[PDB]
């Protein structure tokens, strides 16, 4: 797989594939905390529907550290405090900006695969690889689910 580092710690890549060929998809609620549910799914043991609250907290401490220097926070244009109040609201959408900050905060690699029912691109936060990464599925332009590498890989 070909990753290009476009900015520090951020990589892009262009493979084409059906998601079902390499990954199990573990669907997440539509509430729409799905970005957080998806991270909980892959990082938290005994994950349930409430586990996401803790990822929202790691997101809150991550932001206190990285938000003001995240390149993608420039498209958000909220103060650190307004961002926090919005981000911690129930139902508030997570995104690639939270993936960039959570990658740093949790010392992990997060990959978001977006699907234009097949996969158009991937964006990778952190230096690790598809095998050691947390894999997220971005679908319909508006939704996240978790992915697990299929058994045979």
């Amino acid at each position: 797989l070909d990753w290009t580092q476009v900015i520090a710690g951020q990589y892009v890549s262009n493979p084409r594939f059906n998601i079902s060929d390499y990954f199990e998809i573990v669907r997440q609620p539509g509430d729409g905390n799905c970005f957080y549910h998806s991270i909980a799914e892959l990082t938290m043991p005994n994950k349930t529907d409430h586990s996401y609250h803790y990822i929202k907290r790691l997101t809150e401490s991550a932001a206190r550290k990285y938000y003001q220097e995240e390149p993608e926070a420039r498209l958000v244009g909220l103060s650190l405090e307004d961002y926090l109040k919005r981000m911690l609201s129930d139902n508030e959408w997570g995104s690639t900006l939270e993936a960039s900050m959570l990658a740093k905060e949790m010392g992990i690699t997060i990959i978001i695969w977006t699907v234009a029912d097949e996969v158009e691109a991937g964006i990778k936060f952190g230096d690790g690889d598809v095998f050691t990464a947390v894999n997220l599925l971005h679908s319909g332009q508006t939704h996240f689910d978790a992915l697990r590498i299929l058994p045979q890989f």
């Binding site: 290009t4 900015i7 420039r74 691109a121 319909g140 996240f144």
Partner: protein, 75 residues
């Protein structure tokens, strides 16, 4: 003049621009050719994300330069 924009996909588009065009102008040009909303767009060049208010010339971005277009993905 001409510059290239490589999309998330890896699709490589051409853009007609002046050195005095703002990064914002560029994003609206990209919306015109490829249909991508500007608030989803991150243009990157030389390992820096480029600021809407600035110009291609403010960035020393010459003819036939290639920019990366990374999207902000929400859900």
């Amino acid at each position: 003049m001409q510059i290239f924009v490589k999309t998330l996909t890896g699709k490589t588009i051409t853009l007609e621009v002046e050195p005095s065009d703002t990064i914002e102008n560029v994003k609206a040009k990209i919306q015109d050719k490829e249909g991508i909303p500007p608030d989803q767009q991150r243009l990157i060049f030389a390992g820096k994300q480029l600021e809407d208010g600035r110009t291609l010339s403010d960035y020393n971005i010459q003819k036939e330069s290639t920019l990366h277009l990374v999207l902000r993905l929400r859900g």
